Amino acid sequence: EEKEILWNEAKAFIAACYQELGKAAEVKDRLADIKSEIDLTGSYVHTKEELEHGAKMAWRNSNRCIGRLFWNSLNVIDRRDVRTKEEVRDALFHHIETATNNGKIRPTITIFPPEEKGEKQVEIWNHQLIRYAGYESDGERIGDPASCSLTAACEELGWRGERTDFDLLPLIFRMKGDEQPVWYELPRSLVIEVPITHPDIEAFSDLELKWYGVPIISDMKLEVGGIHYNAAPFNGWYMGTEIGARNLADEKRYDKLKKVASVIGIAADYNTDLWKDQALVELNKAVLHSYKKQGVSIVDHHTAASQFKRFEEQAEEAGRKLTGDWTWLIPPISPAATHIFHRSYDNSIVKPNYFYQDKPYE
Amino acid sequence: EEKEILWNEAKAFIAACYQELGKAAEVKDRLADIKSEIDLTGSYVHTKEELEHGAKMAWRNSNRCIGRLFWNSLNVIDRRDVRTKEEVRDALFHHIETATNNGKIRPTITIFPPEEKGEKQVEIWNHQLIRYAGYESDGERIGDPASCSLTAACEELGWRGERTDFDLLPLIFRMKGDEQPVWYELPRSLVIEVPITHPDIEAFSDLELKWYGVPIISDMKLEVGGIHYNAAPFNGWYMGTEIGARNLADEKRYDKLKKVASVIGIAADYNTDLWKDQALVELNKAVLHSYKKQGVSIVDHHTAASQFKRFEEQAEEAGRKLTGDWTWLIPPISPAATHIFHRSYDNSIVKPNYFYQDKPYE
Ligand code: HEM
Ligand code: HEM
Ligand SMILES: CNCc1cc(OCc2ccc3ccc(N)nc3c2)ccc1Cl
Ligand SMILES: CNCc1cc(OCc2ccc3ccc(N)nc3c2)ccc1Cl
Ligand SMILES: C[C@H](O)[C@H](O)[C@H]1CNc2nc(N)[nH]c(=O)c2N1
Ligand SMILES: C[C@H](O)[C@H](O)[C@H]1CNc2nc(N)[nH]c(=O)c2N1
Ligand SMILES: [Cl-]
Ligand SMILES: [Cl-]
């Protein structure tokens, strides 16, 4: 009864995928083989081109991504051949290295073996391959609260953080057959970090803020043609607002606005002074400036919105139905200064796509 | 077949209204009379208390209003007795005067006779009782583009604007029986305007920006117990963002950001400098400051969001189902610094409420 679910989403996928590549004729005799393969193996295997394109189509259908203009330039690394922890670790190490590309960030996705009978071959515990640890115990609040439960879960595994505000979490994943995950501390040479400075406010460095260069999501499930690549970490570059308006700004994250208001020489006393709004802007100016000063790829929300408009234009031209999540597409900084705010989008889910999956810890 | 629509929404309304006022016993013999009145007259008439409460319940169920905490302090003026243009005009004049209250703005609603057989007794053409005119002709762009079509419609009626950027539109409404609307120029003594200045940037006055004190929506339909008060202008006070982030900021409105960026001494050349975001904040600081300096009521988006949180709290306490429109509840300035951003709301429409109705012009 599963071989009809997998088959009907494989009919849809192959037909559409080969249609876009100009291989519509090759559809019929590829579908046939799949029907055979599914029947006799319970599943089927993608070609280099199907997987590569299917992962680009998945990015294209992400309603919450504002950076989908470059969906076709996605660098797809095929690691469906890995069988050991050392291969997975080194694949993850390589991904970090190639995606970072000395700072000229390259949108990349490493794809590991998909679920067989729903069973995960690999099971990545990291939300991102590079993320800061978080600790809270006895009134103490160190690091990133978002990473509190994974951190505690790592410290149940022999790992121990230095309890600075920017402890790199180790890579932690579990292989099929094993009861517990392994962890590997990250080589620092593989991780670029950016110290946040202001272009004209020298006191800003006293905050000692920094962030990591490359955002590599590693807990989402790639679904391509009925096949579940539960482990397929991908990355883009940062939009400045993700760091300056959320990660470093949220009260339930790094909560830096009052400190920012202090170093920029304004009071944080009255709402009518709009001190949070002013601190948000100066902090966000500092983030973009700090990245471009170091030579790490980053985009501002305005430039990103322009690009997304081109994506909309490009979509209508190709007769492609556009889908988007308005609530996630609008930037948390001056959303009304972008075209996104003033129009609506269809939040319909089209496959291939990236999905949430249940965490293994907590 | 209409007397069953009107009756079933009157059953719902009276039952709920009297329940909240503590007059649940009086429900039965009031409903009876209504069934009689509807049968023999085709409609029914609200008491002072039903109309007053029903208009407060309508405000409470406005999913897009962030200022609903004060739903119960709404000043309800009952003008269902008006029959002439002079009465309507003077009622509208009085509303402006009492709502303004020398600057200590009083949330007020004036309620005119409702539709009889769907026929409007009065038909208000103004979007707001106080709004600036807009002109565009031969590359010229004067005033508020939002008011372009009403302005052109007024100039078809013998009215003529001075073509400044802040021409007060006249009151314009049509009475039952007449083919054309009448217009009345507003007494300036009834209209408070606020000149926008900056607390610490003296050059800001060179922009010669100003706005009107009281926002009085007059083109929405109040629906209370199956009865359609198509003409019931209401007002609150301004949230600063409405003036600084939309009215004066939007490209399709006053489009002031580059001029703002100029007077505050920054470049409007690069997106990565976040010049729009910085101009938005300084412009919004100027608006709140300018209103409080003059003594006209205004609220900032932070204080407003706090109040709306109390409204949520007060709603759960009273066992009231909360409804909201997330897309409209979030402020266009730093929405992620408010609790509203980080939670969801049910956009369900509960009556009594305020609705859009089709414009008579254009
Ligand atoms: C190239 C630069 C990219 C930028 C600037 C960008 C920007 C964004 C941003 C700002 C978000 C919202 C994140 C949040 O609010 O927490 C987002 C969501 C998302 N992006 Fe992208 N993105 C990029 C590339 C990619 C790539 C390469 C993929 C995968 C192939 C991708 C897939 C997604 C997905 C799945 C989400 C939704 C995450 C969720 O549901 O929580 N994006 N993107
Ligand atoms: C007391 C101060 C008030 C504040 C600060 C306030 C704030 C707001 C704001 C900011 C909006 C969004 C407007 C927009 O984005 O264009 C809104 C929408 C709305 N408010 Fe209020 N409001 C107040 C009082 C009232 C009153 C007295 C009523 C009527 C009884 C009301 C009914 C509404 C309605 C119906 C909408 C939706 C308008 C639409 O659908 O376009 N509000 N409110
Ligand atoms: C609160 N965030 C929840 C969440 C976000 C996730 O990803 C956000 C995300 C995903 C892809 C991105 C790609 C590029 C980029 N700059 N940011 C990106 C941000 C994934 C899982 C969860 Cl549970
Ligand atoms: C783009 N706006 C459309 C529109 C807005 C309308 O009202 C917005 C509105 C309504 C009530 C308000 C009450 C108080 C306040 N400060 N702003 C308020 C703003 C009414 C009709 C239309 Cl068609
Ligand atoms: C399509 C989208 O809902 C539309 O642009 C909305 C967005 N949110 C808004 N929010 C407010 N307060 N006012 C508006 O006019 C809008 N416009
Ligand atoms: C409930 C609401 O949808 C939720 O708070 C959303 C709002 N919009 C968002 N937008 C982005 N980009 N990221 C988020 O995490 C959220 N959270
Ligand atoms: Cl992040
Ligand atoms: Cl307005």
Number of other CB atoms surrounding residue A21 within 10 Å:
13
User: What is the C-alpha separation between A67 and B174, in angstroms, rounded?
Assistant: 50
Closest CA relative to residue B169, chosen from B125, B207, B138? B125
Distance between CA A147 and CA A159 in Å, rounded? 14
Is B229:B222 a contact under the CB 8 Å cutoff?
yes
Nearest ligand by distance to the CA of B70: 2
Do A124 and A216 touch, CB atoms closer than 8 A? Answer: no
Side chain identity, residue B258: K
Q: What single DSSP character describes residue B128?
A: B
Please check whether residue B255 touches A, CB under 8 A: no
Pairing label, strands B171-175, B182-184: antiparallel
Beta-carbon contacts of A53 under 8 Å, excluding residues fewer than 6 positions away, are: A17, A20, A21
**Residue A257 exposure: Cα atoms within 13 Å on the Cβ side:** 22
Amino acid at B9: E
Cβ within 8 Å of residue B211, ≥6 positions away: B193, B194, B196, B238, B243, B247, B248, B287
What are φ and ψ of residue B223, in 5° steps?
A: -115, 120
Provide the residue ranges of all domains of chain B, joining segments of one domain with +: 1-80+107-117+221-235+305-329, 81-106+121-192+356-360, 193-215+238-303
CATH number of A1-80+107-117+221-235+305-329: 3.90.340.10
Catalytic site residue B65? yes
Select the residue of A277, A292, A303 nearest B334 (Cβ to Cβ).
Answer: A277
Q: Which residues of A carry out catalysis?
A: 65, 68, 237, 242
Residue A287 near residue A196 (C-beta atoms within 8 A):
yes
User: What's the full length of chain A, in residues?
Assistant: 362
Experimental method: X-ray
CB atoms within 10 A of CB A312: 18
Q: Resolution in A for the shown PDB structure?
A: 2.0
Alpha-carbon distance of B204 to B40, in angstroms, equals 64
Query: In the block, which residue shows the tokens 């505050």?
Result: B264
Tell me which amino acid residue A348 is. Answer: S
- In angstroms, the CA B215 to CA B192 distance is 11
B206-212: long-range contacts, CB 8 A cutoff, minimum separation 24 = B206/B263, B207/B256, B207/B259, B207/B260, B207/B263, B209/B248, B209/B254, B209/B256, B209/B286, B210/B166, B211/B238, B211/B243, B211/B247, B211/B248, B211/B287, B212/B130, B212/B131, B212/B132
Judged on CB neighbours under 10 Å (0-12, 13-18, 19+), B32 is exposed
The partner residues of A182 in beta bridges, in order of sequence, read A173
Nearest to B327 by CA among A273, A247, A324: A324
Cβ neighbours of B83 (radius 10 Å):
12
Largest CA distance in chain B: 70
CA dist B198 → A267, A277, B244, B260, B280 (Å): 16, 16, 12, 11, 13
Which residue blocks in A172-323 are alpha helix, DSSP H?
A: 240-241, 257-263, 275-294, 301-317
Quick check: helix, strand or coil at residue A130? coil
Q: Which of B296, B78, B324 is nearest to B288 (CA)?
A: B296
The finding on whether A212 has its CB within 6 A of some atom of ligand 1 is no
Gyration radius of chain B over CA positions:
22
B322, B346 Cβ separation under 8 angstroms: yes
Q: Quote the tokens at residue A21.
A: 């590549």
Is residue B337 a contact partner of residue B247, using CB atoms and an 8 Å limit? no
Alpha helices in B101-242 (DSSP H): 148-154, 240-241
Chain A residues 221-250 within an 8 A CB cutoff of chain B: 245-246, 249-250
Copy the structure tokens of residue B295. Answer: 């003594």
Which residue from A184, A197, A262, A220 is spatially nearest to A111, judged by alpha carbons? A220
Residue nearest ligand 3's atom 6 by CA? A217
The β-bridge relationship of strands A227-229 and A220-224 is: antiparallel
DSSP state of A84: S
Helix (H) or strand (E) holding A110: strand A108-111
CA dihedral B25, B27, B30, B32 (to 10 degrees): -110
Residues contacting residue A42 through CB under 8 Å, at least 6 positions apart = A2, A3, A116, A117
Inter-residue contact B279 to B264 (CB < 8 Å): yes
C-alpha B308/C-alpha B314 separation (Å) is: 10
* Chain A residues 74-103 with CB within 8 Å of chain B: none
Number of alpha carbons in the 13 Å side-chain half-sphere of residue A295: 5
CATH of B193-215+238-303, one of 3.30.540.10, 3.40.605.10, 3.90.1230.10, 3.30.1370.10: 3.90.1230.10
Closest by alpha carbon to B339, among B317, B310, B306, B296? B306
Strand bridging mode B108-111 / B75-78: parallel
Handedness of CA B90, B96, B99, B104 (dihedral sign): negative
Chain A, 179-218: which have a CB under 8 Å from a chain B CB? none
When CB atoms are compared, the residue of A285, A292, A327 closest to B274 is A285
Cis peptide before B352 (omega within 30 of 0): yes
The number of the ligand nearest the C-alpha atom of B105 reads 2
Residue closest to B304 by CA, chosen among B279, B329, B271: B329
- Residue A246's identity, in one-letter code, is R
Work out the end-to-end distance of chain A between its first and last CA atoms, rounded to an integer number of angstroms: 32
Location of structure tokens 């115990």: A137
For residue B321 the two structure tokens come to 């189902």
E runs forming strands in chain B: 75-78, 108-111, 122-124, 134-137, 140-143, 171-175, 182-184, 193-195, 210-212, 216-217, 220-224, 227-229, 234-235, 238-239, 298-299, 353-356
Among B96, B20, B91, residue whose Cα is nearest residue B56? B20
A273, A292, A327: residue with CB nearest B285:
A273
- Calculate helix-pair angle for A5-21, A48-60, nearest 10 degrees: 90
Helix (H) or strand (E) holding A234: strand A234-235
Cβ separation B335–A336 shorter than 8 A: no
| Six token digits for residue A178 | 């094993």
Taking each helix axis from N to C end, the angle separating A5-21 and A27-41, rounded to the nearest 10 degrees, works out to 150
B334 to chain A: which residues are within 8 Å by CB? 245, 276-277, 280, 332-333
**Pairing mode, strands B220-224 and B353-356:** antiparallel
Task: Indicate the fold that domain B81-106+121-192+356-360 takes in CATH.
Answer: Nitric Oxide Synthase;Heme Domain; Chain A, domain 2 (3.90.440)
Question: For chain B, what is the total number of helices (H) and then of strands (E)?
Answer: 10, 16
Mutating which of B274, B294, B298 best tests the A interface, going by the most A Cβ atoms within 10 A?
Answer: B274
Q: Is the Cβ pair A285, B273 closer than 8 Å?
A: yes
Asked whether the bond before B113 is cis by omega within 30 degrees of 0, the reply is no
Cα A225 off chain centre by:
21
Min distance A337 CA to chain B CA atoms (Å): 7
The answer to whether A51 and A27 are in contact (CB under 8 A) is no
